[PDB]
Design a protein around this motif. Structure first.
Motif, PDB file in Angstrom:
ATOM      1  N   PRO A  33     -34.585 -10.552  33.357  1.00  0.00           N
ATOM      2  CA  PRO A  33     -34.145 -10.290  34.732  1.00  0.00           C
ATOM      3  C   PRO A  33     -34.637  -8.943  35.231  1.00  0.00           C
ATOM      4  CG  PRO A  33     -32.305 -10.720  33.200  1.00  0.00           C
ATOM      5  CD  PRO A  33     -33.482 -10.253  32.430  1.00  0.00           C
ATOM      6  N   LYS A  34     -34.173  -7.896  34.537  1.00  0.00           N
ATOM      7  CA  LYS A  34     -34.334  -6.496  34.909  1.00  0.00           C
ATOM      8  C   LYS A  34     -34.701  -5.636  33.710  1.00  0.00           C
ATOM      9  CE  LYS A  34     -34.342  -7.245  38.480  1.00  0.00           C
ATOM     10  NZ  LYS A  34     -35.030  -6.922  39.755  1.00  0.00           N
ATOM     11  N   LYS A  35     -35.104  -6.242  32.590  1.00  0.00           N
ATOM     12  CA  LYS A  35     -35.332  -5.477  31.371  1.00  0.00           C
ATOM     13  C   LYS A  35     -36.534  -4.556  31.506  1.00  0.00           C
ATOM     14  CE  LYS A  35     -33.135  -5.811  28.394  1.00  0.00           C
ATOM     15  NZ  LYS A  35     -33.200  -6.682  27.188  1.00  0.00           N
ATOM     16  N   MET A  36     -37.505  -4.928  32.342  1.00  0.00           N
ATOM     17  CA  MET A  36     -38.607  -4.023  32.642  1.00  0.00           C
ATOM     18  C   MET A  36     -38.111  -2.782  33.374  1.00  0.00           C
ATOM     19  SD  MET A  36     -37.938  -6.215  35.110  1.00  0.00           S
ATOM     20  CE  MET A  36     -38.755  -7.716  34.610  1.00  0.00           C
ATOM     21  N   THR A  37     -36.980  -2.894  34.068  1.00  0.00           N
ATOM     22  CA  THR A  37     -36.341  -1.762  34.715  1.00  0.00           C
ATOM     23  C   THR A  37     -35.300  -1.122  33.810  1.00  0.00           C
ATOM     24  OG1 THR A  37     -34.603  -3.094  35.722  1.00  0.00           O
ATOM     25  CG2 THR A  37     -36.698  -2.951  36.882  1.00  0.00           C
ATOM     26  N   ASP A  38     -34.564  -1.945  33.050  1.00  0.00           N
ATOM     27  CA  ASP A  38     -33.588  -1.441  32.085  1.00  0.00           C
ATOM     28  C   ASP A  38     -34.241  -0.555  31.034  1.00  0.00           C
ATOM     29  OD1 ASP A  38     -31.165  -1.120  30.751  1.00  0.00           O
ATOM     30  OD2 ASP A  38     -31.483  -2.909  29.522  1.00  0.00           O
ATOM     31  N   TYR A  39     -35.515  -0.813  30.746  1.00  0.00           N
ATOM     32  CA  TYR A  39     -36.301   0.011  29.841  1.00  0.00           C
ATOM     33  C   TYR A  39     -36.372   1.455  30.321  1.00  0.00           C
ATOM     34  CZ  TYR A  39     -40.399   1.058  26.920  1.00  0.00           C
ATOM     35  OH  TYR A  39     -41.298   1.588  26.026  1.00  0.00           O
ATOM     36  N   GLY A  51     -36.699   5.368  28.705  1.00  0.00           N
ATOM     37  CA  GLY A  51     -37.996   5.779  29.199  1.00  0.00           C
ATOM     38  C   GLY A  51     -39.111   5.122  28.416  1.00  0.00           C
ATOM     39  N   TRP A  52     -39.865   5.922  27.651  1.00  0.00           N
ATOM     40  CA  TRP A  52     -40.942   5.446  26.776  1.00  0.00           C
ATOM     41  C   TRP A  52     -42.009   4.679  27.558  1.00  0.00           C
ATOM     42  CZ3 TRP A  52     -38.763   3.026  21.609  1.00  0.00           C
ATOM     43  CH2 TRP A  52     -38.265   4.047  20.802  1.00  0.00           C
ATOM     44  N   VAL A  53     -42.725   5.410  28.420  1.00  0.00           N
ATOM     45  CA  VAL A  53     -43.543   4.814  29.477  1.00  0.00           C
ATOM     46  C   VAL A  53     -44.555   3.820  28.913  1.00  0.00           C
ATOM     47  CG1 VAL A  53     -43.168   6.787  30.971  1.00  0.00           C
ATOM     48  CG2 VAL A  53     -45.102   6.798  29.422  1.00  0.00           C
ATOM     49  N   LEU A  54     -44.713   2.703  29.620  1.00  0.00           N
ATOM     50  CA  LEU A  54     -45.528   1.588  29.160  1.00  0.00           C
ATOM     51  C   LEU A  54     -47.017   1.866  29.304  1.00  0.00           C
ATOM     52  CD1 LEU A  54     -45.752  -1.423  28.211  1.00  0.00           C
ATOM     53  CD2 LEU A  54     -45.468  -2.064  30.585  1.00  0.00           C
ATOM     54  N   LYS A  59     -44.200   0.506  18.225  1.00  0.00           N
ATOM     55  CA  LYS A  59     -44.608  -0.106  19.494  1.00  0.00           C
ATOM     56  C   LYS A  59     -44.519  -1.635  19.471  1.00  0.00           C
ATOM     57  N   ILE A  60     -43.277  -2.120  19.417  1.00  0.00           N
ATOM     58  CA  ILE A  60     -43.022  -3.528  19.700  1.00  0.00           C
ATOM     59  C   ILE A  60     -43.498  -3.884  21.104  1.00  0.00           C
ATOM     60  CG2 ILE A  60     -41.146  -3.798  18.061  1.00  0.00           C
ATOM     61  CD1 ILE A  60     -39.210  -3.275  20.408  1.00  0.00           C
ATOM     62  N   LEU A  61     -43.874  -5.158  21.254  1.00  0.00           N
ATOM     63  CA  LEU A  61     -44.372  -5.711  22.539  1.00  0.00           C
ATOM     64  C   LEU A  61     -43.189  -5.975  23.476  1.00  0.00           C
ATOM     65  CD1 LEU A  61     -47.477  -7.780  22.761  1.00  0.00           C
ATOM     66  CD2 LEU A  61     -45.566  -8.574  24.168  1.00  0.00           C
ATOM     67  N   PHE A  62     -43.487  -6.152  24.763  1.00  0.00           N
ATOM     68  CA  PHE A  62     -42.482  -6.366  25.802  1.00  0.00           C
ATOM     69  C   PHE A  62     -41.513  -7.495  25.463  1.00  0.00           C
ATOM     70  CE2 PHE A  62     -41.427  -8.908  29.592  1.00  0.00           C
ATOM     71  CZ  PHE A  62     -40.674  -7.992  30.303  1.00  0.00           C
ATOM     72  N   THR A  63     -42.028  -8.601  24.925  1.00  0.00           N
ATOM     73  CA  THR A  63     -41.217  -9.810  24.820  1.00  0.00           C
ATOM     74  C   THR A  63     -40.125  -9.682  23.761  1.00  0.00           C
ATOM     75  OG1 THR A  63     -41.321 -12.217  24.551  1.00  0.00           O
ATOM     76  CG2 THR A  63     -42.886 -10.906  23.249  1.00  0.00           C
TER      77      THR A  63
END
Lengths: 33, 48, 65, 39, 32, 145, 264, 252
Positions: free
Chosen positions: H203-209, H214-217, H188-192
């Motif tokens: 840009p869109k990495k929160m969506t590209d995820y 998947g791997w829901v936040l 579980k690496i952090l968002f950044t």
């Protein structure tokens, strides 16, 4: 063309008639003793 | 006349290196491993 | 031949079970518990422990071979 | 049969056994004894 | 010389093949 | 059916060792390449023993000696099966085919045939290419495993 | 170097790649070993002035590939360019395999002579009769009757003993071989009947082996007819040896079944 | 004959009809002169070199309009002319750069065996010189090292026109390699770190995820599920012949 077709069959047969016959010799040799 | 091999073996070298780390070290830091890996990219040692 | 005999016995007893469950046979009590007494054994071969039973022996026979 | 290009004329894991690779290799621990006696 | 030699070669070929197929089963019988 | 063809093919191979020495004393031997292609075509059809392996060995040597595609051309060259080469041409054929397997990142399928080629004809003392094959041999072994 | 010139869809260069396609298959046969796409597309291409012309290159490339049948099909489809190319060292084995496939097909058609017989390609049998026309009168026509036996045909079988080689005793050893190597009776009687027909056709009437094959043909009415012809000749010196030939070889039931025709 | 060789080939290239016109004009070049064996005809390899240049600039216009099925034609005809069956004259000024482009083509479509099978053409011309190859050797033998980010600063200096058309596929490959490397068991690496440290300055990495895996936040973590296979102890079907590795190889 009789040589270019019909003669080749001879060799195309003969080689097997060599090698396979040797095999049979071995096989009947294997039987004999 | 076999120029290619060196270019395609250096990875294999680092392969051996990390394999040694897979046997020797238990809990080594991401930035504290590369000192004995001499490539000097702790910025890339995490995904090395 | 053991597998053939087992298949024969299982075919006969499924025939018997068919003609008692759906058929003109009495549901008399002799086997109706003995069957699940047989079915109670059914050893759970695939578990976490039987690995150490199997592999530790098979490689020994392979070494001898 | 000859295809000559050869120039006129264990040993798999044992070369790096003693060359310099321990604290007692050639000098007898003297490389550290300058800073080993502080303890 | 021509033609008939090919036929007699092929003739002794299946003849030899008959002996070959024979030698296996007679060996199998004679062993037991 | 006199089968002098394969004996004369070995004669041709022995003198074509020196003729390939001539062809490296000069430029490429593409005419000879066409000639040996025709010799392979008349081989494998009427007679095929010990001539085909020698001429393809010459083909591989000429193709590796020049830096061209040269290799997957051989990989699709499906004359991969010459028969018993009296323990002499077969070993060098295995050496060439192992190198031309290693040239596209072979993955230890070539190390075993390199070992087989090395151990298959080691009887000669400093044969001429034994140092080269031994040098190339454990390149792939130190590479992979 | 490896050349993919046939990428374009330009038909002009499809026809103009003929020289390239012919030139590359002299030493680089293993180079082109993957042209299942371009060769087949070009052969099935409609606007195509090298139709019946580019298929020879297809046979050439498939010859190295080990596709001895695809080579055969494209050799059939390579028309006049393949026909006139009947004198070359490479094409010898191609046409030899063509004749071998043809005679295997002939055996297949001889298995059942009515229904489900594959229609022989006219260019295929054209190649067959053309290489037979190469084996015309040049003396030593024993193969001329031979391949006539293996092709199961009869008109060429008659013409070979009828052609201007010679007739000393050709018609005798023809019998010797035909009952020497007869695979079955069903073909043996077939060739035997045209043999005995041409025996009767000869100026001197046939005497001995006509009867010998006739009792191998089981034809008592024919021998009754020819003995009646000898009666018209009004001497038995031909039938002299015929009676003892019947005694030597003919079955008792054959004689008992021809005797009532003899007295009729 | 010898017309408009560089008619519109230097200032820009928006004249697509002129590209088609030159390609149709090429009929006098290839099939109107000896080109296949190139054994004789001493005085054609000058205009054959010119033909090489026309093909190079035409396929470069085609990659300017980004056409790979003509970049195959780039590496189809011209290669065996400077490297013809008859070596006659010095090749060009562009040739090593062209080979750098072809090497990068073989690189960019994950053909490492087809990468290796033409770097040996030169004995020593670019193994120590020729930056047109000094970039591709690193660009190849950097993807075998577990460093995966100094390639883009090494992309910062480009000895050719853009080297970006391949760099897009490089971006693609970095995306799915970082995906397939993180998709195994991890903690579980952090968002950044998954967001800015690799690429895409949020840009869109929160969506590209969600686009990739998947791997829901949850509370700012990117956990990897366990995914360890149990080692199912059946081994009957795949190892019954292995179990029979006496009888069905040793005849007794």
């Amino acid at each position: 063309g009789l040589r270019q077709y019909y003669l080749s069959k001879i060799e195309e047969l003969q080689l097997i008639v060599n090698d396979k016959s040797q095999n049979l010799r071995r096989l009947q040799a294997q039987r004999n003793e | 006349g076999t120029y290619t091999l060196i270019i395609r073996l250096r990875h294999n070298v680092i392969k051996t290196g990390v394999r040694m780390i897979s046997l020797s070290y238990s809990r080594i830091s991401l930035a504290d491993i590369a000192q004995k890996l001499q490539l000097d990219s702790p910025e890339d040692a995490e995904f090395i | 031949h053991g597998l053939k005999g087992l298949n024969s016995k299982l075919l006969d007893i499924r025939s018997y079970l068919e003609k008692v469950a759906t058929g003109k046979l009495p549901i008399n009590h002799q086997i109706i518990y003995q069957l699940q007494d047989v079915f109670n054994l059914l050893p759970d071969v695939s578990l976490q422990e039987f690995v150490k039973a199997f592999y530790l022996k098979t490689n020994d026979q392979m070494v001898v071979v | 049969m000859s295809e000559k290009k050869q120039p006129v004329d264990e040993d798999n894991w044992d070369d790096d056994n003693v060359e310099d690779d321990f604290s007692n290799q050639l000098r007898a621990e003297l490389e550290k004894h300058g800073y080993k006696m502080e303890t | 010389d021509l033609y008939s030699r090919y036929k007699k070669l092929q003739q002794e070929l299946e003849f030899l093949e008959v002996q070959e197929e024979y030698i296996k089963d007679e060996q199998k019988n004679l062993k037991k | 059916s006199t089968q002098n063809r394969r004996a004369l093919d070995l004669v041709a191979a022995k003198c074509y060792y020196y003729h390939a020495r001539v062809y490296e004393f000069l430029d490429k031997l593409d005419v000879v390449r066409s000639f040996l292609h025709a010799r392979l075509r008349t081989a494998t059809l009427r007679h095929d023993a010990d001539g085909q392996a020698t001429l393809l060995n010459l083909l591989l040597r000429n193709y590796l000696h020049y830096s061209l595609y040269d290799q997957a051309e051989k990989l699709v060259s499906k004359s991969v099966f010459p028969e018993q080469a009296n323990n002499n041409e077969w070993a060098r054929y295995l050496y060439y085919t192992g190198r031309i397997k290693a040239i596209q990142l072979e993955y230890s399928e070539a190390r075993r045939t390199m070992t087989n080629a090395l151990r298959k004809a080691p009887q000669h003392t400093a044969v001429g290419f034994k140092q080269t094959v031994h040098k190339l041999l454990i390149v792939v072994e130190l590479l992979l495993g | 170097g490896i050349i993919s010139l046939l990428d374009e869809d330009e038909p002009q260069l499809k026809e103009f790649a003929l020289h390239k396609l012919n030139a590359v298959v002299n030493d680089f046969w293993a180079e082109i070993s993957e042209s299942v796409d371009k060769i087949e597309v070009l052969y099935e291409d409609e606007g195509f002035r090298s139709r019946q012309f580019a298929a020879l290159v297809a046979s050439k490339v498939f010859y190295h590939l080990g596709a001895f049948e695809e080579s055969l099909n494209y050799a059939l489809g390579a028309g006049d360019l393949f026909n006139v190319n009947d004198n070359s060292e490479y094409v010898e084995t191609i046409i030899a395999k063509c004749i071998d496939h043809y005679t295997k097909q002939c055996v297949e058609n001889a298995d059942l002579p009515e229904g489900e017989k594959k229609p022989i390609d006219q260019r295929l049998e054209g190649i067959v009769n053309k290489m037979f026309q190469r084996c015309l009168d040049d003396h030593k026509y024993k193969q001329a009757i031979g391949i006539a036996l293996e092709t199961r045909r009869l008109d060429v079988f008659e013409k070979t003993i009828l052609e201007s080689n010679d007739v000393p005793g050709m018609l005798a050893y023809s019998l010797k071989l035909c009952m020497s190597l007869m695979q079955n009776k069903q073909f043996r009687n077939k060739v035997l009947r045209v043999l005995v027909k041409i025996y009767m056709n000869l100026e001197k009437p046939d005497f001995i082996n006509v009867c010998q094959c006739l009792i191998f043909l089981d034809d008592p009415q024919a021998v009754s007819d020819i003995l009646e012809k000898l009666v018209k000749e009004d001497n038995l010196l031909m039938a002299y040896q015929i009676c003892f030939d019947l005694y030597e070889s003919a079955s008792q039931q054959f004689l008992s079944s021809v005797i009532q025709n003899l007295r009729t | 004959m010898y017309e408009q060789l560089k008619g519109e080939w230097n200032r820009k290239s928006p004249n697509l009809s002129k590209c088609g016109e030159e390609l149709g004009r090429l009929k006098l070049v290839l099939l109107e002169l000896n080109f296949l064996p190139t054994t004789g005809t001493k005085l054609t390899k000058q205009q054959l070199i010119l033909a090489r240049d026309i093909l190079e600039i035409g396929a470069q216009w085609s990659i300017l309009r980004k056409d790979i099925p003509s970049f195959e034609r780039y590496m189809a005809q011209l290669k065996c002319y400077y490297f013809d069956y008859k070596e006659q004259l010095p090749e060009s000024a562009y040739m090593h750069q062209l080979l750098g482009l072809n090497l990068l083509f073989l690189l960019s479509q994950n053909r490492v065996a087809e990468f290796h099978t033409e770097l040996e053409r030169l004995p020593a011309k670019d193994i120590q010189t020729n930056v047109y190859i000094k970039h591709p050797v690193s660009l190849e033998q950097y993807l075998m090292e577990g460093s995966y980010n100094k390639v883009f600063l090494a992309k910062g200096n480009i000895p050719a026109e853009s080297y970006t058309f391949f760099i897009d596929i490089l971006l693609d490959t970095i995306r799915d390699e970082i995906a397939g490397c993180i998709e195994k068991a991890y903690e579980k690496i952090l968002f950044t770190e998954a967001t800015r440290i690799l690429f895409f300055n949020t840009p869109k990495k929160m969506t590209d995820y969600a686009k990739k895996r998947g791997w829901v936040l949850g509370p700012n973590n990117y956990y990897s599920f366990a995914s360890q296979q149990q080692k199912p102890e059946d081994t009957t079907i795949p190892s019954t012949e292995l179990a029979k590795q006496v009888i069905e190889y040793a005849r007794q």
